[PDB]
């Protein structure tokens, strides 16, 4: 760690790959450390004698001589969302997990998986199983989708980032058997898909969790190269250095980067494409990549870049045809030094527009200006950018819901549908044109920061100045959901939605 | 652009030089795109048939068959200050501009000229004229002065700084005929004088409008060199680098400059004099030149701008009875490992020590060494201009500068100069009893006193660095160098300084 | 002062070494410029004729024909703490100083000595004396301790730091005779001890009064080397540079130091011991040594100053039976491109990781590595002094330091040492339940907890870097190292630390 | 709820009285819903076959065929503080609760009892038991104290205040058997004592949890009258209204109360004593009783609540050898036309004048008159409790109260009482030099000093109203009266005050 500030050396991530499979084993006959069962409120109904009506629960309780029904009533478990009962008995352990009533997939089944991972961690389980108390009326396909969402919840719920702390226990969880939901090639493909996405989500969490003295712009570029190296027959990489970006006239990006002489900036360009020669839709994913932003209360730095690189990691495995995807991150750290940009400075973006920098706490959007111009210059048809852009969007939508801004109603609809499929939370917000007048400069084409009221909107209107009108473009302000204050950890928010969006194109 | 942070390049200022002349042409006979008429409230009086009493306005109206009087009453124009009517008719365009009642020159005539420029801009006028509705009761001198003030308004009102905008429209205005106020050599000399002063005001606006990534200290020094090069027979230049200032023991200035290793400091010294060898009154003009101040301050370097603006004007005017030293200790106040910390104790070139209790008041540290330097040139009188305090804006608002001097006579000179230029300033007291609040427990003084009286203690601080045999006045111009309404620099100070120099 | 920022050059200190002695001379027979007398309220009792009952005061008044009793009653002097009467008469000058009632020693005697110094300074006295109005009810040992405390007050009271200002007169005080409190070898050894401690206290004041552009980390290292050089038979020095600290894995200290590329860091290690071979208790004194802290606070480096002060005193006193390690991890906390960011995770030399959630609390990071280094020297007991928190001043005010230890015995030793020194400190609890608020979501801990309990969690942080086998006390001295009343450093801590070392 | 603001009506509390007893029943033979076992880390040691070495745990595990040891290791339970395992099996339920290593009693046993209550609540248990895994090395007396502490944890842990919300289930807990710690009259008397103290602690929690629109000063007086009525042979009451306090010259208290014309003030005086005629030590307990303070802080009235709590406990316990005065000057601090302004000068009932420079510190004005009233009852010792300052929370965090006294003996009594009660407090210094910052330019004193030292100067203020012949300690309880974690009042202070009274 000789050249790392603070001499910090990340511990080697020693997480096992969980072995996940869908089995036809009867639930009452399954043997291992922990069985988790997802039950709705209706699944917990009892008869005249206070016995479970549900066949699976009735049988498990019988075999336990009424210990499961007794514990459940004593502990007031009736299958409400978030509730759980944990029962250790001779030969095994059962946890019932409440699904509530009328809970949406995939989110309910993600939660179920998360709860199963938590109960595994708290009992040092190695081999676990998950099932639903009832699958009546469900198609083979809904069941497949529930299985893959359960898998996702277990994998993401088992992740623990211990790279920067001296005391930790490695995860005990080695296998997951998903029961009752089908077997064979199709359900296994879907589980594999989920696993590919999770590996992207987990990369995103790691990139964000890591502090700026570890994930520098040069380190972020190396992560990009590692993805390309792993998937070199479908992903290529081009890393531009400051001098190359200067030749491309990226004055807004380079001005933000100028202070940080010790950790130089790198402009990251990955391109995914299968070598086959059918028609491909050309897409870009642009992520804000300030590895530190001068403007540890805000632990969301780089969430956007992380979601973009996480998506690349997923897509490298999934290998969709019919799409060409450009992943673009203008990476730098925003520091303070004699070589730095001052408030009031006027910088020129690579499309010639001039920006009066009235607020040095909003420098991220400057880097995005040049990244968006670059994306448009790759000849893409559609762009999504993700950025932790404003506090204002968290005032508006809270910690958990990202704001989506687009001139293009169709692309809004695509992104809303992708989020519905992934389970991620977002909400379209208006690009109210009248607010652009508040962004006028008395010397330059525009200022970089408008009034507090409307701030997430004028942030979006700012970015629009750097997007070719013929390209469809949506901006996702993810300041809130990239970081979980409760878990004190990154989420990798965005990856799953982006993957779904690419795949549905 | 290549070596500029943000890759930003100033667009070439493409503005035409307006052709200005005084002409004897009767106002009703004049032909061109726009005729602007300045009318007082009394000039707009009407008779019992609602017809203008004023002979010029009566004639124009009757020639337009009552269209001008009708439009005027409909639009409630009665000649009040700020009022205007704009009438397009076959063969031309007239705008009447209200002058109010008993309004002071040159400000009223500046405003008239500004209003004419604005009406030109909004009609794309190329050739305009301006006249007063009545000139009777004005001396030949006052008419001359009115003409030059009109010219000033039109020139300054036509200026638009589009250097950093990727889209803009070039001024259409090409010529101004000033009517009814006299013709011949004298009025033409006065108009030319106004033009020379405007070019200095406009340089000042440009220096301030430009951001710190464009106007660095090196660039400020180049602008000084360019003035000397343009007027080389009357203006000389010496630019001192950090190592030269160090030999001159400028520890206060060099401490402030120490952080900014990327944009090194330059100490600017221009000297104006005509090349004849008669005795000349020796003056200095010192301007605060922090191209950026770490402590939105869009008024940074307003002082230095006014000082260089004055040089530019004087280089053209060539006054014979004066030797003027223009002095700017230019640097940017940044943050870095090489920088001065709060608490540091720095030593000015006169040997006095300063405890720097507040790094938002570093400007005055640079002025300390600039003032000592000025006194060392052997001058008789110094004016410094500086955006020194927020306190002065609390005291006097955005539009009126504060003037501080121990020397009553110099105060009177500067008040008279501002009366002649039209600029707003107000003397403030150098209340001695407040010096006690500037005591240090370790050094000779601290740099920043309490908020109450802050502009006064700022002045008292500077007075520590001025030879008491030299007459010295400090002008705290934090407010009026920048117009929040126009979102632009004003070039405040240039016209007053030039009038001050000339009256010496 | 070519390489000093601001070109500041400290003036050469010209303080007299005061000649101090204890004499058996009758107070009324003593000859010189000023006689100061310490009188309690009870000492000032008068009889039925309004004459002093105190024998000494009665005698002096009788010599002055009632002038002293008359001046006293007119000026309402009754011996209350802080009161004084100053009477100039033919052949000399007397000042009576109030000691109050049941005031604690040595503080009451320090104050006496300070008041005698102040009266000497205000009358330009060269030769002075001090006596108590009454020594009834005092042991020989208490009188000896009173005498040395009076000497301490006079020496410290006569100090004036004029290194950074032009206007000063050198102290006139040349001698002090202490009367009525005994004579001979023992009292003289005590006075000498007090003098040695004062020279340390004065070094401490100087190191703190000097600004960060003068006392950089290199300069602080040179001060350490000078101490070792002066006392080279009992004090050794090792200065470690950044590369050596990196080999010792001091990632927390080096992270804080990384920004300040212009003034590099030095880790200072002094060791005191007499060359005799009796068993020695191994002690460490660790001082926070941020010469400037980016998080006007004038208390920077008060901890390091106390530690180096103590070394200076101990070098002269030469106690046997101790080996004392003096450890200061010196650096300045600046802002640059090379600097640590908030959120960075740094690794101390014991392997523990710290998530730096607040860059205003970097001082404790340097102490982490200093404390580990101290434990690695195999010491039995450590005291650290550090200006660690604002919270401790909220808690205990400007004058009383907070003491934090797991070790009840060491608390008792430090409380007793302060009792003997006269310095004010108070033990505060290391409430363990607060450690939970120092959890990180990524590292082993954060560096800053919530405001409530901030001095406690500061202490609990430091505890993570201290071997449990070692007894350890943390002293948060943010308040008393700097006197806002004097506008000067106090050298707080030196006298206590010397008493602690001596009582081991 | 016609006359209550907001029409709020407290729901009737329906808490079971838990039946508590000590039994000699072998733990393995005990029958009921839930058995909780307190185990230290050392208790959880295993042998070479991974079987519990502890005899009780070995036996229980053997009955459960290894299920308990297996669940324990799987769930990483090793007996650390806060840890727990909960195992439901045929015929019952066991919970193992970690006690950590060398944790102090009674706190460790309180926590045990709280964890047993929580497990009862989460499993709807009616009949529970608690035992220690090991009682080796405990005296009979320590076991008795452990049992009563366990009872206290269970009773306090089972409390839930549902008066102001619609959704709640009544506690299922009906009985507790305490096992392994002894049987018979002595242990039963101790348990009974703990129950009496709990009923006080619970009254305290209720008085604080209730909002100011429910617990007004009139209502607080009625609570006092209810206590006296319940225990009328040992507790008498006198409620003084505003007019009576005016005759007693309580200008400081009445000034604070003047704004609140809608909810008038009442001065509460309870007196406890048994009717037997042995010598009784006269004590006062004074509580701050601002039912609302205009200066969301949920700690209002925590002091008064502790005092009334103590009266409730003492009414049942009936100690001989004491007479205890319980004094609360109750009012609300509001804003109206009738109110006190900042700057007003008020006169306390001892004649001293106070310039009220800060209306956020009015609570101390009411205490001034309460303390004078207490001294006028001829008591020997006074403790006041008050949520006086934010400063004390900065100092000591949320959990530890600050204790201020001139009287070293009383400090020792209160520190010992807290030791016995388990409550956290810490003595802080009454640094006399800070009194100078409380000077007024017009009155005898101001009411608020500078932020630094604010808890100390608070104490020094209160001292002005205390007869020096009376021993007096001030407890600043701003932190621990309210638990942000529970979102509920704690009734902090009651148990300590009861122990203090009993040890007199
Ligand atoms: Cl981002
Ligand atoms: Cl931004
Ligand atoms: Cl929509
Ligand atoms: Cl300026
Ligand atoms: Cl300044
Ligand atoms: Cl320190
Ligand atoms: Cl710190
Ligand atoms: Cl101990
Ligand atoms: Cl209270
Ligand atoms: Cl209060
Ligand atoms: Cl005492
Ligand atoms: Mg698999
Ligand atoms: Mg990070
Ligand atoms: Mg012309
Ligand atoms: Mg500018
Ligand atoms: Mg001597
Ligand atoms: Mg006097
Ligand atoms: Mg210092
Ligand atoms: Mg009972
Ligand atoms: Mg558990
Ligand atoms: Mg309440």
CSV table of N, CA and C in Angstrom, one decimal, chain A residues 327-395:
chain,number,residue,atom,x,y,z
A,327,UNK,N,-20.5,2.5,-22.9
A,327,UNK,CA,-20.4,2.8,-21.5
A,327,UNK,C,-19.4,3.9,-21.3
A,328,UNK,N,-19.8,5.1,-20.8
A,328,UNK,CA,-19.0,6.3,-20.8
A,328,UNK,C,-18.9,7.0,-19.4
A,329,UNK,N,-17.7,7.1,-18.9
A,329,UNK,CA,-17.5,7.8,-17.6
A,329,UNK,C,-16.3,8.7,-17.7
A,330,UNK,N,-16.6,10.0,-17.5
A,330,UNK,CA,-15.5,11.0,-17.4
A,330,UNK,C,-15.0,11.1,-16.0
A,331,UNK,N,-14.0,10.3,-15.6
A,331,UNK,CA,-13.6,10.2,-14.2
A,331,UNK,C,-12.5,11.2,-13.8
A,332,UNK,N,-12.7,11.7,-12.7
A,332,UNK,CA,-11.8,12.7,-12.1
A,332,UNK,C,-12.1,12.8,-10.6
A,333,UNK,N,-11.2,13.5,-9.9
A,333,UNK,CA,-11.6,13.9,-8.5
A,333,UNK,C,-11.6,15.5,-8.5
A,334,UNK,N,-12.5,16.0,-7.7
A,334,UNK,CA,-12.7,17.4,-7.6
A,334,UNK,C,-12.0,17.9,-6.4
A,335,UNK,N,-10.8,18.5,-6.5
A,335,UNK,CA,-10.0,18.9,-5.4
A,335,UNK,C,-9.8,20.4,-5.3
A,336,UNK,N,-9.0,20.8,-4.4
A,336,UNK,CA,-8.6,22.2,-4.2
A,336,UNK,C,-7.1,22.3,-4.2
A,337,UNK,N,-6.6,23.2,-5.1
A,337,UNK,CA,-5.2,23.4,-5.2
A,337,UNK,C,-4.9,24.7,-6.0
A,338,UNK,N,-3.7,25.1,-6.1
A,338,UNK,CA,-3.3,26.3,-6.9
A,338,UNK,C,-3.7,26.1,-8.4
A,339,UNK,N,-3.7,24.9,-8.9
A,339,UNK,CA,-4.0,24.5,-10.3
A,339,UNK,C,-5.5,24.4,-10.6
A,340,UNK,N,-6.3,24.7,-9.5
A,340,UNK,CA,-7.8,24.5,-9.6
A,340,UNK,C,-8.6,25.6,-10.3
A,341,UNK,N,-9.8,25.2,-10.7
A,341,UNK,CA,-10.8,26.1,-11.1
A,341,UNK,C,-11.4,26.9,-9.9
A,342,UNK,N,-11.6,28.2,-10.2
A,342,UNK,CA,-12.2,29.1,-9.2
A,342,UNK,C,-13.7,29.3,-9.4
A,343,UNK,N,-14.5,29.7,-8.4
A,343,UNK,CA,-15.8,30.1,-8.7
A,343,UNK,C,-15.7,31.3,-9.6
A,344,UNK,N,-16.7,31.5,-10.5
A,344,UNK,CA,-16.7,32.6,-11.5
A,344,UNK,C,-16.0,32.3,-12.8
A,345,UNK,N,-15.1,31.3,-12.8
A,345,UNK,CA,-14.4,30.9,-14.0
A,345,UNK,C,-15.4,30.6,-15.1
A,346,UNK,N,-15.0,30.8,-16.3
A,346,UNK,CA,-15.8,30.5,-17.5
A,346,UNK,C,-15.1,29.4,-18.3
A,347,UNK,N,-15.8,28.3,-18.4
A,347,UNK,CA,-15.2,27.1,-19.1
A,347,UNK,C,-16.0,26.9,-20.3
A,348,UNK,N,-15.3,26.2,-21.3
A,348,UNK,CA,-15.9,26.0,-22.6
A,348,UNK,C,-16.0,24.5,-22.9
A,349,UNK,N,-17.3,24.0,-23.0
A,349,UNK,CA,-17.5,22.6,-23.3
A,349,UNK,C,-17.1,22.2,-24.7
A,350,UNK,N,-17.0,20.9,-25.0
A,350,UNK,CA,-16.6,20.5,-26.3
A,350,UNK,C,-17.5,20.7,-27.5
A,351,UNK,N,-18.7,21.2,-27.2
A,351,UNK,CA,-19.6,21.7,-28.2
A,351,UNK,C,-19.6,23.3,-28.4
A,352,UNK,N,-18.6,23.9,-27.7
A,352,UNK,CA,-18.4,25.3,-27.9
A,352,UNK,C,-19.1,26.2,-26.9
A,353,UNK,N,-20.1,25.6,-26.1
A,353,UNK,CA,-20.9,26.5,-25.2
A,353,UNK,C,-20.1,26.8,-24.0
A,354,UNK,N,-20.3,28.1,-23.5
A,354,UNK,CA,-19.5,28.6,-22.4
A,354,UNK,C,-20.4,28.5,-21.1
A,355,UNK,N,-19.7,28.2,-20.0
A,355,UNK,CA,-20.4,28.0,-18.7
A,355,UNK,C,-19.7,28.8,-17.7
A,356,UNK,N,-20.5,29.8,-17.1
A,356,UNK,CA,-20.0,30.5,-15.9
A,356,UNK,C,-20.2,29.7,-14.7
A,357,UNK,N,-19.1,29.4,-14.0
A,357,UNK,CA,-19.2,28.4,-12.9
A,357,UNK,C,-19.5,29.2,-11.6
A,358,UNK,N,-20.8,29.5,-11.3
A,358,UNK,CA,-21.2,30.3,-10.2
A,358,UNK,C,-21.2,29.5,-8.9
A,359,UNK,N,-21.1,28.2,-9.0
A,359,UNK,CA,-21.1,27.3,-7.8
A,359,UNK,C,-20.2,26.1,-8.0
A,360,UNK,N,-19.1,26.1,-7.2
A,360,UNK,CA,-18.1,25.0,-7.3
A,360,UNK,C,-18.6,23.7,-6.6
A,361,UNK,N,-19.7,23.7,-6.0
A,361,UNK,CA,-20.3,22.5,-5.5
A,361,UNK,C,-21.2,21.7,-6.5
A,362,UNK,N,-21.4,22.3,-7.7
A,362,UNK,CA,-22.1,21.7,-8.8
A,362,UNK,C,-21.2,21.5,-10.0
A,363,UNK,N,-20.0,20.8,-9.8
A,363,UNK,CA,-19.1,20.6,-10.8
A,363,UNK,C,-19.3,19.3,-11.6
A,364,UNK,N,-20.0,18.4,-11.0
A,364,UNK,CA,-20.2,17.1,-11.6
A,364,UNK,C,-20.9,17.3,-13.0
A,365,UNK,N,-21.9,18.2,-13.1
A,365,UNK,CA,-22.6,18.4,-14.3
A,365,UNK,C,-21.7,18.9,-15.4
A,366,UNK,N,-20.6,19.6,-15.0
A,366,UNK,CA,-19.6,20.0,-16.1
A,366,UNK,C,-19.0,18.8,-16.7
A,367,UNK,N,-18.6,17.8,-15.9
A,367,UNK,CA,-18.0,16.6,-16.5
A,367,UNK,C,-19.0,15.9,-17.4
A,368,UNK,N,-20.2,15.9,-16.9
A,368,UNK,CA,-21.3,15.2,-17.7
A,368,UNK,C,-21.5,15.9,-19.1
A,369,UNK,N,-21.4,17.2,-19.1
A,369,UNK,CA,-21.5,18.0,-20.3
A,369,UNK,C,-20.7,17.4,-21.5
A,370,UNK,N,-19.4,17.2,-21.2
A,370,UNK,CA,-18.4,16.7,-22.1
A,370,UNK,C,-18.6,15.2,-22.4
A,371,UNK,N,-19.0,14.4,-21.4
A,371,UNK,CA,-19.4,13.0,-21.6
A,371,UNK,C,-20.6,12.8,-22.5
A,372,UNK,N,-21.6,13.7,-22.4
A,372,UNK,CA,-22.7,13.6,-23.2
A,372,UNK,C,-22.5,13.9,-24.6
A,373,UNK,N,-21.7,15.0,-24.8
A,373,UNK,CA,-21.3,15.3,-26.2
A,373,UNK,C,-20.5,14.2,-26.8
A,374,UNK,N,-19.6,13.5,-26.0
A,374,UNK,CA,-18.9,12.4,-26.5
A,374,UNK,C,-19.8,11.3,-26.9
A,375,UNK,N,-20.8,11.0,-26.0
A,375,UNK,CA,-21.7,9.9,-26.3
A,375,UNK,C,-22.5,10.2,-27.6
A,376,UNK,N,-23.0,11.5,-27.8
A,376,UNK,CA,-23.6,11.8,-29.0
A,376,UNK,C,-22.7,11.6,-30.2
A,377,UNK,N,-21.4,11.9,-30.1
A,377,UNK,CA,-20.5,11.8,-31.2
A,377,UNK,C,-20.1,10.3,-31.5
A,378,UNK,N,-20.6,9.4,-30.7
A,378,UNK,CA,-20.5,8.0,-31.1
A,378,UNK,C,-21.6,7.5,-32.0
A,379,UNK,N,-22.5,8.4,-32.3
A,379,UNK,CA,-23.6,8.1,-33.2
A,379,UNK,C,-24.7,7.2,-32.6
A,380,UNK,N,-24.9,7.3,-31.3
A,380,UNK,CA,-25.9,6.5,-30.6
A,380,UNK,C,-27.3,7.0,-30.9
A,381,UNK,N,-28.3,6.2,-30.8
A,381,UNK,CA,-29.7,6.6,-30.9
A,381,UNK,C,-30.4,7.0,-29.6
A,382,UNK,N,-29.9,6.4,-28.5
A,382,UNK,CA,-30.5,6.7,-27.1
A,382,UNK,C,-29.4,6.7,-26.1
A,383,UNK,N,-29.5,7.7,-25.2
A,383,UNK,CA,-28.6,7.8,-24.0
A,383,UNK,C,-29.4,7.8,-22.7
A,384,UNK,N,-28.9,7.1,-21.7
A,384,UNK,CA,-29.3,7.3,-20.4
A,384,UNK,C,-28.1,7.7,-19.6
A,385,UNK,N,-28.2,8.8,-18.8
A,385,UNK,CA,-27.1,9.2,-17.9
A,385,UNK,C,-27.6,9.0,-16.4
A,386,UNK,N,-26.7,8.5,-15.6
A,386,UNK,CA,-27.0,8.4,-14.1
A,386,UNK,C,-26.0,9.3,-13.4
A,387,UNK,N,-26.5,10.1,-12.5
A,387,UNK,CA,-25.7,11.0,-11.7
A,387,UNK,C,-26.3,11.3,-10.4
A,388,UNK,N,-25.5,11.3,-9.4
A,388,UNK,CA,-25.9,11.9,-8.1
A,388,UNK,C,-25.7,13.4,-8.2
A,389,UNK,N,-26.7,14.1,-8.8
A,389,UNK,CA,-26.6,15.4,-9.3
A,389,UNK,C,-27.0,16.5,-8.2
A,390,UNK,N,-28.1,16.3,-7.5
A,390,UNK,CA,-28.6,17.4,-6.7
A,390,UNK,C,-29.1,16.8,-5.3
A,391,UNK,N,-29.0,17.6,-4.3
A,391,UNK,CA,-29.7,17.4,-3.0
A,391,UNK,C,-31.2,17.6,-3.2
A,392,UNK,N,-31.5,18.5,-4.2
A,392,UNK,CA,-32.9,18.9,-4.4
A,392,UNK,C,-33.8,17.6,-4.7
A,393,UNK,N,-33.3,16.7,-5.5
A,393,UNK,CA,-34.1,15.5,-5.9
A,393,UNK,C,-34.4,14.7,-4.6
A,394,UNK,N,-33.5,14.6,-3.6
A,394,UNK,CA,-33.9,14.0,-2.4
A,394,UNK,C,-34.9,14.7,-1.5
A,395,UNK,N,-34.9,16.0,-1.6
A,395,UNK,CA,-36.0,16.8,-1.0
A,395,UNK,C,-37.3,16.4,-1.6
